[PDB]
DNA sequence: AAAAAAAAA
């Protein structure tokens, strides 16, 4: 039967007309073909064609054929009658009441139609091809189950008249795509990636502009020659679509380490070792783990290793995952610089990928006229970022690929053609570490090479990550009998893993010498007791005792406190003590409005960092901060005083001590004899005690084992970096360090709880997804999280006078905008930037279950993604001008300008 | 009680 064009696929926004189903199908088949040839990394075409075990050209046409079948489930009465249509020639298949989505219909029909073209009835390949297409709206379905000998009828396809039109369609795209014979094999992981491809295909050719265009040259009839014409036309008009969305490859020339970084006169020890021993190792899919200290050129090292592995695997794309949004911003700058120099592309975006990327003026858009590597409007969309040829963003963006959520197969497809580089792997907690492990496991099976950068890494984590990657590569998991692939890490050191054979190659094995790093003075670590008042720390004396030389002779110091309260206490006291005259005083923590925090930080690195010392602005000064100091802040301090924290974190903090001493530029005061970290700890009165406020942030046992490990050294300095990795390993490894068996077990139990939540959250192991994709998107009883915990909400403080009316400043000069200064009273981007710039992150708690109507944003705000979820915090200001502490959620708040938000 | 991330076709 020749095919009827009366059956549509699109109607919306089409100004009264309808695009035919066949035309969408051919379009979507065309896009997939082009995507295969012009978007896919060559390595990825290879990986896929191997799973099907056929040549690439065939694999392509198969894929294109499949793509053209994605919306066939639309050829039902349930879908068709959503608008006016003349179905009089089509009696039967009366409405069932099921209300069954069209993609669900595809996956229900395809298993019993495919065999008429060659597919093995009840085959694994047929099963997967139906399931995968059935999942082209981001949700896979179960394999169809039936009890009769007539599944088609059993599933609602009872009318000969309807069944004819669906086979017409089936043959129309089969023919139009060159009638590809069925592949022999197809596995789950490969199928899920292809699902991604099919989804990108649908999306590209569903753009209103592209549609209105094809709508000017519909086919006259349903003849083979006409549909052949339609397909070939859409074939031509798709590469244009790629460029308009900036999906074109960024390819980078092979290059030695120096040719890639010509501005570098004296390549690092780490860089020399990597560049020398790695090209011979990088013969295909592998994982590299570099673990080295801060300030050793890890970034350039990474790009190079990434460039090798990219070439070895025909994968030109890149994802760099960073721990924070800010570091992602910075790295996005470096990589883009690297791009410009390294390539000899106005249709390829270097995407920036995190939740605040839209409100970045320098990144977001306000064709062919474009800046190179610039964001396109298309990639700025939801779910599309990883489809950018190159991208840097938060690690959370990659981790979202292995969560059981809609459209994850899209993100999986995005990564599958790239080299993924995750930086600061030491920063990933036990919940994130299970997600990382599932990603590595899935990346391993998909042939994607990985570079893991870290600072020191506990050997067990190191072991888990490479074990995870090897599992994916090798098809099978780890035995109980099987030996561990990584039993030791060296800091500094690197490590190569071959995916094909599973050979681990330590840097030790290829060179007996240790990797030369910046030499530096060992770190003096000094445990000092503090009197406890009211289960708190009376740091008063000591602060005076230890800071005394700095008031006379000058210098730079930092005090690090476990909580924001304790951080605010210390500042206040420093101020009281300082009213008695030079030196300066600063306070940094997370509870400041953005604009303020981005300002405080800038001046603080301005004084204590490298471009400060170089420019002479470095003072003759004290900083008080919380764990924000553990983030990348360019600081060099002459003395550091810290509350006890876990050693990994202490040692992390202590890397701010004399950070740039090898620069030779800085003059240290006569009292700063050696680089020193002072570690405060409560005096006791037989397993160590710590403040409740401390034990709520860090598990008690960890603080105990850390104190015990440090006491044991009797004053002895920490040689750097020879002593570090052993400390890091030992705090967890040495059981004699924990004398509170009860506190220690709890610690272990809390860790279990976090890995457990994680396992609920993630998609199956690749081998569990072999013949069944349904578990990738299965969930019941909300949104799954990339990080553990109750999280944070963004608050905004508004001001109320006696009158009383709503203001944005204590001075009551800036009216609280009920509306937005855009046409229609709507908010703009640049509007949302001004509001968000004064928002404060606040940690979720009981206070949120006690909010009221005046804690919620006005009606106009709900229309805005960025403002809808804000919490409003009132602040009462007296008619004298003083700001009062104000109750919200069952407690009192006050946004002090020097001390940040207080509650 | 830290810090950190987080509308499709
Ligand atoms: N020989 C060199 N090798 C690598 N980087 C160098 C070299 N000489 C100067 N640099 C620069 O040193 C700067 C900072 O060094 P770097 O090792 O990156 O420390 P960092 O940025 O504080 N920590 P990280 O970014 O994680 O590596 C970068 O801008 C480099 O370009
Ligand atoms: Fe669809
Ligand atoms: Fe579609």
TrEMBL record:
Residues 14-204 form the HD Cas3-type domain. Fe(3+) 3 binds at residues 71, 136, 202. Pfam families: Cas3-like_C_2, Cas3_HD. Fe(3+) 2 binds at residues 71, 102, 136-137, 202. One of its GO terms (molecular function) is RNA binding. The keyword ATP-binding applies. One of its GO terms (biological process) is defense response to virus. Keywords: Antiviral defense, ATP-binding, Helicase, Hydrolase, Metal-binding, Nuclease, Nucleotide-binding. ADP binds at residues 266, 271, 295-297, 300, 659. Fe(3+) 1 binds at residues 24, 70-71, 202. ATP binds at residues 266, 295-299, 334. The keyword Ion transport does not apply. In the N-terminal section; belongs to the CRISPR-associated nuclease Cas3-HD family. In the central section; belongs to the CRISPR-associated helicase Cas3 family. PANTHER family: CRISPR-ASSOCIATED ENDONUCLEASE_HELICASE CAS3, DEAD-BOX ATP-DEPENDENT RNA HELICASE 47, MITOCHONDRIAL. This is CRISPR-associated helicase, Cas3 family. It comes from Thermobifida fusca (strain YX). The lineage of its organism: Bacteria, Bacillati, Actinomycetota, Actinomycetes, Streptosporangiales.
